[PDB]
From a paper:
Here, we describe the characterization of the periplasmic binding protein AtzT, including high-resolution ‘closed’ structures with bound ligands. The X-ray crystallographic analysis shows that AtzT is a two-domain protein, with each domain containing a central β-sheet of 6–7 strands, with 2–3 α-helices on either side of this central β-sheet and a C-terminal extension of about 45 residues. After identifying the unknown compound binding to AtzT as guanine (using a combination of X-ray crystallography, mass-spectrometric analysis and SPR) and searching sequence databases for the sequences of homologous proteins, we believe that AtzT is a purine-binding protein that can accept 2-hydroxyatrazine (and possibly atrazine) from the environment when it is present and guanine is absent.
The structure with 2-hydroxyatrazine diffracted to a nominal resolution of 1.65 Å; it belongs to the same space group (P21) and has the same fold and closed form as the other structures that we have determined. This structure was obtained prior to the SPR data and used the aforementioned 2-hydroxyatrazine-contaminated sample of atrazine for co-crystallization. Modelling atrazine into the structure resulted in distinct negative difference density at the Cl atom, which was alleviated completely upon replacement with 2-hydroxy­atrazine. The occupancy of the binding site is thus suggested to be effectively entirely 2-hydroxyatrazine, which agrees with the affinity data presented. The same residues contribute to the binding of 2-hydroxyatrazine as to the binding of guanine in the binding site: Asn220, Glu165 and Ser97, with the ring packed on either side by Tyr45 and Trp194. 2-Hydroxyatrazine does not fit as well into the binding site as guanine and has some steric clashes on the side with the isopropyl moiety. The N atoms of 2-hydroxyatrazine are well within hydrogen-bonding distances of Asn220, Glu165 and Ser97 and the hydroxyl moiety makes a bond (2.9 Å on average) to the backbone N atom of Phe98, analogous to the carbonyl of guanine. We have also determined the structure of AtzT bound to 2-hydroxyatrazine and shown that the binding affinity of this substrate for AtzT is 2.2 µM, which is significantly (>600 fold) tighter than atrazine at ∼1.5 mM.
Numbering used by the authors: 28 to 360
The structure:
């Protein structure tokens, strides 16, 4: 019989960003494994308590492998996994494991560091902007990596952050982008899921980056590049392991070296000196010659976090709740 695989999304496949990319991973798994797998998905599932009913129903319907693709499914996934010990659960970006519960994530911050390098080359104000969802480790690593990448070019760069308290709401994302631009940011990145920030950047004559997918068709003048998320090989490997009986609970983190994180082509507006530097830093990121959180690092209180010649430990990366010097908030509107 085919292995029944289900995907739980916190957003819509029509976001053209994060959920789109997870769903392209599901479709890659279907193409790679053919008749050996039967996939289904549910979109726009609310995070926290109400997700538990959806996850339980997919397990009750006979799914043997369930991917919960958002941070806020962590505790519902852990509870359903205890109730379904013969089902394999994989939770994106979480830190809770069990005999039948693994966690997976990308090192997207490797891409965000490269975006910061390019932002420092393209900014006219010296202020880069970040549209944030919630202050969880995934997002704080991306804010810090954007800032460190920019500071590798111009140590005087400032990063302004605005929080929308949602992963996906194109109206709120549009308003947040307008506010960052009004407060002097002219190269924007995000950890929300829509092309709204890009559309605002194009309207105002500013720059921004795609997130999880190439978003250039939404804003071809503003789109400098994008950090593309490729989940298809991970979803394939995981479904293969369950079918073959090799699956075990583990924490998986893949980056540019493993092909989970890739960069879109550069916009034609990027000048040759910036393009050359970007390609050198990209090669170094893939080879591990540079790491985004290599020392020396200080936090925003001036405390040393990592000495020169050391790297930030995996446990500090996993729990990151501190900001590098140069990160600030927006004035509340
Ligand atoms: C709709 C839920 N979206 C979501 N959830 C988690 O956990 N992380 C991300 N990250 C993107 C790169 C911003 N997005």
């Amino acid at each position: 019989e085919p292995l029944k695989v289900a995907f739980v999304y916190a957003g819509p496949v029509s976001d053209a960003g994060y959920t789109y990319a997870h769903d392209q991973g599901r479709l890659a798994m279907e193409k790679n494994l053919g008749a050996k797998v039967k996939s289904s998905y549910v979109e726009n599932v609310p995070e926290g308590a109400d997700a538990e009913r959806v996850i339980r129903k997919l397990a009750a319907d006979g799914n043997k492998l369930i991917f919960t693709t958002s941070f806020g499914f962590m505790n519902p996934t852990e509870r359903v996994a205890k109730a379904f010990p013969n089902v394999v659960f994989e939770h994106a970006t979480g830190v809770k494991l069990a005999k039948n519960l693994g966690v997976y994530e990308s090192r997207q911050y490797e891409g965000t560091y490269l975006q910061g390098v390019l932002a420092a080359k393209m900014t006219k104000t010296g202020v880069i902007g970040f549209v944030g969802s919630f202050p969880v480790p995934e997002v704080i690593r991306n804010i810090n990596a954007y800032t460190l990448g920019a500071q590798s070019v111009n140590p005087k760069i400032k990063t302004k952050v605005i929080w929308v308290s949602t992963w996906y709401d194109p109206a709120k994302e549009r308003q947040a982008a307008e506010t960052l631009i009004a407060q002097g940011a002219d190269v924007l990145t995000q950890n929300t899921n829509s092309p709204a920030t890009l559309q605002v950047a194009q309207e105002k004559g500013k720059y921004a980056f795609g997130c999880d997918a190439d978003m250039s068709k939404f804003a071809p003048k503003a789109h400098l590049t994008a950090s593309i998320s490729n989940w298809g090989d991970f979803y394939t490997k995981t479904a293969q392991a369950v079918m073959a009986g090799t699956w075990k609970s583990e924490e998986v983190h893949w980056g540019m070296a493993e092909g989970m994180v890739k960069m879109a082509p550069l916009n034609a507006a990027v000048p040759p000196d910036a393009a050359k530097l970007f390609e050198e830093k990209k090669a170094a990121m893939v080879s591990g010659k540079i790491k985004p959180f290599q020392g020396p690092l200080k936090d925003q209180s001036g405390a040393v976090k990592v000495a020169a010649g050391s790297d930030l430990p995996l446990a500090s990366l996993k729990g990151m709740n501190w900001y590098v010097q140069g990160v600030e908030g927006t004035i509340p509107k």
